[PDB]
Design a protein around this ligand. Sequence first.
Ligand SMILES: CC(=O)N[C@H]1[C@@H](OC[C@H](N)C(=O)O)O[C@H](CO)[C@H](O)[C@@H]1O[C@@H]1O[C@H](CO)[C@H](O)[C@H](O)[C@H]1O
Ligand SMILES: [Ca+2]
Ligand SMILES: [Ca+2]
Ligand SMILES: [Ca+2]
Ligand SMILES: [Mn+2]
Length: 1106
Amino acid sequence: MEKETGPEVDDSKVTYDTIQSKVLKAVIDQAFPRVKEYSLNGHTLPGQVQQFNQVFINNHRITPEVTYKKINETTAEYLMKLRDDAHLINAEMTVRLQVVDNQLHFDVTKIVNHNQVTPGQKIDDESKLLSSISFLGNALVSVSSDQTGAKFDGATMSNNTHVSGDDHIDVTNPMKDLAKGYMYGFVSTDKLAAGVWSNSQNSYGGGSNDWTRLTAYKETVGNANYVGIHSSEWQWEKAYKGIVFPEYTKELPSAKVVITEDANADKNVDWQDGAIAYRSIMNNPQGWEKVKDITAYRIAMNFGSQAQNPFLMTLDGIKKINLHTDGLGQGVLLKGYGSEGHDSGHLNYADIGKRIGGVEDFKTLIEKAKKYGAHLGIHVNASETYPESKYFNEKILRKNPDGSYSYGWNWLDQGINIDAAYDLAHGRLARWEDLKKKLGDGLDFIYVNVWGNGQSGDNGAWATHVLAKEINKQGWRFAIEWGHGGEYDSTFHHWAADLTYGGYTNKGINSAITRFIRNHQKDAWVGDYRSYGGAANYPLLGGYSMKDFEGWQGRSDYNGYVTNLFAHDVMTKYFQHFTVSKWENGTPVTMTDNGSTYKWTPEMRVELVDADNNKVVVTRKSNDVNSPQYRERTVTLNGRVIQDGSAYLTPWNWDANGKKLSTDKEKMYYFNTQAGATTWTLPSDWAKSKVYLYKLTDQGKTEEQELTVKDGKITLDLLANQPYVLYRSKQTNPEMSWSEGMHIYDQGFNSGTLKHWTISGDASKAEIVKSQGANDMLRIQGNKEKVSLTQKLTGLKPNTKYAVYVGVDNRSNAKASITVNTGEKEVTTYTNKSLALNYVKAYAHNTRRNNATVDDTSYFQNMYAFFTTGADVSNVTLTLSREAGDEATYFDEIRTFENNSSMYGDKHDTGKGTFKQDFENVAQGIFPFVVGGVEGVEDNRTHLSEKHDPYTQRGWNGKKVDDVIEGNWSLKTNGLVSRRNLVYQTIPQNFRFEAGKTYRVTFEYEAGSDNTYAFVVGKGEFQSQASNLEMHELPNTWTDSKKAKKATFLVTGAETGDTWVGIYSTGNASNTRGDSGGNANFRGYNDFMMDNLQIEEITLTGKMLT
Ligand SMILES: CC(=O)N[C@H]1[C@@H](OC[C@H](N)C(=O)O)O[C@H](CO)[C@H](O)[C@@H]1O[C@@H]1O[C@H](CO)[C@H](O)[C@H](O)[C@H]1O
Ligand SMILES: [Ca+2]
Ligand SMILES: [Ca+2]
Ligand SMILES: [Ca+2]
Ligand SMILES: [Mn+2]
């Protein structure tokens, strides 16, 4: 390339003015809100040196008619009239330029559209809206190739660990052309650096073209090249299908420049100085301050009516983590907080799940969690819905150009995507307000799943900012699924924080510039995941690594959850208590992974600081990518080593909510991923103190040991992958009030003792033991006489109907029982040997080997008693018992909760009399059935279907069968045809067919096809050597009937007491009658629904005999 030239500047017809603070002067044009040049401490940066007196309004070029007024020494104002008759533009906007110390503020302070526009109302011609305002072509700041050290540095969105989103461009003549959007952008000389912020929600496209609030341009002026940073275009009045959006969707355009000398004392002026200064002018995502102290994120899952994780139970999980981390902060995402659980009832945000304890228990969870620094969030969806949801309506549904439904997710039911723009234009905001009204204060975050993938149409920067603003207005923090989503407002990105998702192209934001700026404000980054290479091969700042133990994707590994907190998250969060001040890259390395060999330039040293002038230095131990030292760092705090390679001894001076700890509560955490002794220098305020070490377990601080301090040092030679904590004085563990609000003490056997139970019989026969997943359970075995354990049920309401269950896995033939005595009445339920394996994937005691009870299996199933309190609730007792037997019974999870079922002779209490299940008052699950093994351990595709006429019922969109047969609820199975396996079955603890007695079993059913499902009678444990079943294939219920059919069967209990009945998915092909895809799923060809179950003990007489 040859040296470039462009027109010189003739300013003979220009009148300039100046506005200035004490430190910064800006020369501004009186004709147009343009800054020619900035001066600070005798140094200069150009602005827009060549006049460009045009703006673009709705993408039309306009020469504004401008009048000017200098308001005061720092502030000028411009009235800009905008007229273009041919394009129906008739408007005016007012702009102010204001110097605030070393900042320049550009604000559109008033906009008037002379066309008639009413937010929320019809507009007959959308071209009458004032929809976009662009000042592209007027740089807010620039640098010239004639200036020493002229450079531009900008960040774009990249989620590929191999590809940095950052550009670093020397501003030279000649240079390559530049006309490109950026999220962040800095220009600098060797004397001054500038950064630019804008609230513009412009996009130039997806990927690296998105979130492009700035635009950088090269312009050649005389003999110099300038690179200028412009705000990208701003949005204003918008509509969807002629309906103007609500007023709150309009945000007045704003941009700021900040200009700085050296800001990190390294005696160089570059983009890093700009980035430090940029923190004073940037938007900050709402709730960001909380992020640095949320050390323990995880998901607690409910799904398919099962109530795997009742709100009050999650509080016990929080207490376990509080003990095990010694008071680190927590963030629990409640996936399935609403309706029947995860992916039920979407859009009705206020519908808090009733079977997990409803709004009352959710409020209690939020309140009691505060003292543990545990913040709750919920999973919501703003992109698709199901017929059951109150908000399912034809008008909200997304249609394709050909008129067909845009079908969404199919799992429990077939959903349909919604049109998010229609939704915004028709009262979406009110749904968040309804949830806020019902739930009240204290919820931390809303996690909006799926948004950003286009299912509901436009989910880009503007639409996401609007959505985030609705959520933030209720006082909630915004969180999102995708690494690329919600760049402006999000504080958490699930695909950044769960390192296992999506592979190397779909992770967090791969930008040193962006991470420098915002590391402390969000978990949005690239964490350590060696097999992705590039930025993920041991990032020096770490990066959030999320695991779970409460059922999400079948995750149950508590111990691995805790070790991962300490292996990745403690130091990640430590760094978030400081701001990045310096970032030094090393030499490029060559890596090979994921099918390519590529160059990567790694960070080698990162420095951070806080408001107390503490200094943290993180250094990679080697730039050699093939050395073990590439994946090691040292960390110093004011020069003192706190991490070196596999071990750290890190101070922690913040309580679980982030508040500064008192001196006597200051501590240090030790963790080493390897065996071996390590030696550490103590800080001066520890060097002469006594020091005590504790091993951290689910019981809190254990194995107290005073350490020997020699020459101000300590040496630690402890277990690998085991957290420890150090203090300068002896510490104890607090009372945890286990299971508070649940009417019993320590329902999950987490307190390490049984002393709060009254034990009758030989107490040595009852012990707390760990499952194969380390889940503590009550075990009774080897007893020659009855052993019972009793507690009072406390805090009950008088004259109230209740259910109680205990999870039970009985490996003995001996009777294992749950008994409630109300003071006035006693009810009891028992099981002999358990015969049904547990297939509920989100449930902690399913039969997956790694959370098996014993012998690699789990037969845990909920064993219920139903009772009613009288006038006096001071002596209501719950007893677990086990008659004599050699083998073990395991019990875990005692849940007592209001319930209004009437299953026993039309009465509530466990008792004699005809059994009936109308499904209208189910405590949880699909009682008296339990899900079978048809899908193995799964988020089972059988659940309680909820009525919403007409959408859930025959005829809507050609639906062949009703989701709900009678009342508001039925038992629905979605699409589980041709599986040759058991869909669900009774178990004797839920309904016992007594030996030698005969029962009439009746129910109503829908079936979409002939002989796809069968009513079956079995006994003992089902094996798919296959078990004998009595098989009754069921015809479809709609080709020759306008409603569900009634079925009736006689069943005599086998002498072994283990008879059961159920529904089996046959080997027959279903018939979708020429329909396919979403239509076929929605219409119910492959479905089965049951309702109005009745089981009556009878004596065979007369014609019953035939
Ligand atoms: C990872 C995740 O959140 N997936 C949910 C997402 O799935 C679509 C893509 N595969 C993706 O974004 O990852 O959105 C759908 C709803 O449209 C589901 O919520 C996905 O989660 C899945 O939910 C089902 C139950 O519906 C099961 O629990 C799966 O285990 C779970 O991954
Ligand atoms: Ca510097
Ligand atoms: Ca337990
Ligand atoms: Ca019903
Ligand atoms: Mn449903």
